[PDB]
């Protein structure tokens, strides 16, 4: 009622897109790519129809890659901070399930009670995993089973089961040598298996190249930091309102 | 008594390759084995039409499998009987070779040894063991036990020598070097070889659409031996 006025005020303006983009991750400095990369996961496709038949996707995926110290993790922490229904793991230590359900037995009194857990407890949402490259073979396959069949099938020494998880997966994956390798094919650089690779669209690799606009902006911004004044640099929308805005924007069937 | 069918690697080039050297890194297997038959799915329009036409007959109108049955009426053995027969001969009689056959096989084996040594003067890459001789023997007794006779004969063996000779012909039977061109890596890539090894060859040949385990080792062993 009182807020809907604000929502209207948001949809009216022609810049609020740009406002979104610039206002996403204050901590992080620039890059402008992974800003969009992060937000466009929060707002997903129709993920519905086309029947008869098999259902389209729907949702989205991203895997950030780059030489360390690039603060690729700050994004992550910002997502687990900002959006509800978000799980954060650092796996390598997943360890296994982890991203799937146990299932819990016994209870007692009949059992078949199910652990949350990790990946699936975040549902219709954004799960954030650091370092795909550390978890080796075992679980990656499970993730593939999540992003291919879209369902999580669970049978262990007991009651058979099928549990749905419809999720977006944001990963941060370090290169083979933690570096480029510009000359190498990205295909060869990321070092995760082909089928899981082809399901992530798209990567938004971060690289360092000589620049002067951005350079000037860095020196300016850093000196600003150390300089109590002016630290008056700010963005547009806060962190609290952007949620109710988004949740509003979710109710549309584009 | 083991009867083994191995699968050879890379196809016809393994014949272009030394006849041994196939199984793992070691020919010793082939040394233990008495009769080694290199074979192939050879295709001849004559023979290929034979087999084909035979299959066309097999599907329908179906009635070819009768030839065996009239072979049974006239001559051939039902194979239900062959088994009983084998048991029979197997338990009843134990054959023994004749002396002239023996000396004949001595001549056989010394000609083998001498001639094929002369062949290997050039270091021709391939073998001869007294075990092979012993094999030839066991064939003679086997076939003697076919006739069921308590005693061997000369012609009887005369078959065996040639048969095993076909086996020797099987013992008897360039490379792009592309993969073998491990030089590029070893050089201008790694003077220390470290940080590479079997691992490097992979990443470098892993997404290069290219390298098999035997391929990688072969080219490696090759270059190891080649002295590169």
Domain ranges, ordered by start, for chain A: 1-254
Pairwise CA distance, residues B50 & B42, whole Å: 13
- Indicate the burial class of A184 (C-beta count within 10 angstroms; 0-12, 13-18, 19 or more): middle
Greatest Cα pair distance, chain B, in angstroms, is: 76
What are the chain A neighbours of B203 within 8 Å (beta carbons)? 176, 188
Q: Is A70 annotated as a binding residue?
A: yes
Bridge partners of residue B96, in order along the sequence: B151
Q: Is the separation of the CB atoms in A251 and A45 below 8 Å?
A: no
Residues A64, A129 contacting (CB under 8 angstroms): no
Strands A151-155 and A61-65: unpaired
* Sign of the dihedral through C-alpha B80, B82, B83, B87: positive
DSSP B14-41: HHHS-SSS-STT-SHHHHH-S-------
B206 contacts in chain A (CB < 8 Å): 188
User: Hey, which residues does A164 pair with through a beta bridge?
Assistant: A151
SS3 B76: coil
A38-66 burial by CB neighbour count: b if 16+ within 10 A, else e? bbebbebeeeeeeeeeeeebebbbbbbbb
The 3-state DSSP class for residue A51 equals coil
A69 is in an annotated binding site: yes
| Residue of chain B whose alpha carbon sits nearest to that of A194 | B207
CA distance A188 to chain B (A): 6
Chain B closest CA to A246's CA: distance in Å? 42
Rounded to an integer, what is the distance from CA B219 to the centroid of its chain? 24
Instruction: Please answer yes or no on whether B206 and A185 come within 8 Å at the CB atom.
Output: no
Distance, CA of B15 to CA of B13 (rounded, Å) = 5
Q: Is A94 annotated as a binding residue?
A: no
Task: Indicate which technique resolved this structure.
Answer: cryo-EM
B206 at interface of A, judged by CB pairs closer than 8 A: yes
Q: Please list the residues that pair with A66 across neighbouring strands.
A: A206
Could you please report the per-residue DSSP string of A7-40? HHHHHH-SSHHHHHHHHS-SSS---SHHHHHHHH
Could you please state the CATH topology (level 3) that the domain comprising A1-254 is classified under. Answer: Rossmann fold (3.40.50)
Query: Using the beta-carbon criterion (under 8 Å), do A176 and B203 form an inter-chain contact?
Result: yes
Peptide bond before A106: cis, by omega within 30 degrees of 0?
A: yes
B203 in A contact zone (CB under 8 Å)? yes
Angstrom CA distances, A157 to A103, A104, A138, stand at: 10, 11, 19
What are phi and psi for residue A61, nearest 5 degrees?
-145, 150
Question: Is the minimum CB–CB distance between A53 and chain B shorter than 8 Å?
Answer: no
Q: Cα dihedral sign for B210, B214, B219, B223?
A: positive
The two beta strands, A168-173 and A126-130, are parallel
């Amino acid at each position: 009622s009182d807020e809907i006025n604000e929502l209207k005020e948001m949809v009216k303006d022609e810049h609020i897109y740009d406002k979104l983009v610039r206002s996403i991750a204050p901590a992080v400095f620039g890059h402008e790519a992974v800003k969009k990369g992060i937000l466009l996961q929060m707002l997903g496709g129709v993920h519905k129809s086309t029947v008869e038949g098999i259902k389209l996707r729907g949702d989205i995926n991203i895997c950030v890659v780059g030489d360390p110290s690039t603060s690729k993790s700050q994004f992550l922490k910002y997502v687990v901070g900002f959006a509800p229904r978000s799980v954060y793991t650092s796996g390598k230590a997943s360890s296994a399930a982890g991203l799937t359900a146990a299932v819990v037995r016994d209870e007692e009194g009949g059992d078949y009670t199910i652990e949350a857990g990790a990946l699936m407890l975040a549902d219709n949402g954004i799960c954030c995993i650091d370092e795909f490259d550390k978890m080796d073979i075992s679980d990656q396959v499970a993730i593939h089973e999540a992003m291919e069949q879209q369902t999580i099938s669970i049978a262990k020494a007991g009651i058979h089961a099928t549990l749905n998880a419809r999720t977006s997966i944001l990963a941060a994956a370090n290169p083979v040598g933690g570096r480029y390798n510009r000359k190498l094919s990205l295909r060869g650089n990321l070092n995760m298996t082909a089928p899981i690779m082809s399901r992530f669209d798209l990567f938004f690799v971060i690289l360092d190249d000589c620049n002067e606009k951005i350079d000037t902006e860095l020196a300016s911004h850093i000196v600003d930091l150390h300089m109590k004044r002016d630290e008056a640099i700010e963005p547009p929308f806060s962190a609290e309102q952007l949620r109710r805005y988004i949740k509003y924007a979710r109710t549309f069937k584009p | 008594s083991v009867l083994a069918a191995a699968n050879p690697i890379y196809g016809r080039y393994d014949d272009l390759k030394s006849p041994g050297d196939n199984i793992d890194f070691q020919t010793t297997i082939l040394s233990r084995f008495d009769m080694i038959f290199i074979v192939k799915d050879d295709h001849n329009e004559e023979r290929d039409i034979s087999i084909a036409n035979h299959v066309i007959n097999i599907h329908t109108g179906n009635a070819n499998a009768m030839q065996n049955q009239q072979e049974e009426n006239g001559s051939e053995i039902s194979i239900e009987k062959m088994k009983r027969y084998i048991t029979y001969c197997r338990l009843k009689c134990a054959p023994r070779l004749s002396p002239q056959a023996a000396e004949k096989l001595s001549s056989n084996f010394v000609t083998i040894r001498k001639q094929l040594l002369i062949n290997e003067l050039e270091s021709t890459e391939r073998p001869i063991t007294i075990r092979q001789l012993e094999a030839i023997i066991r064939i003679t007794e086997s076939l003697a036990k076919l006739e069921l006779s308590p005693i061997a004969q000369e012609r009887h063996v005369d078959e065996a020598i040639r048969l095993f000779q076909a086996s020797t012909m099987d013992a008897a039977s360039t490379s792009l070097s592309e993969i073998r061109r491990f030089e590029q890596e070893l050089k201008r890539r790694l003077p220390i070889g470290w940080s590479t090894s079997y691992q490097t060859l992979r990443r470098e040949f892993v997404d290069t659409h290219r390298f098999s385990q035997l391929a990688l080792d072969k080219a490696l062993y090759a270059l190891e031996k080649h002295e590169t």
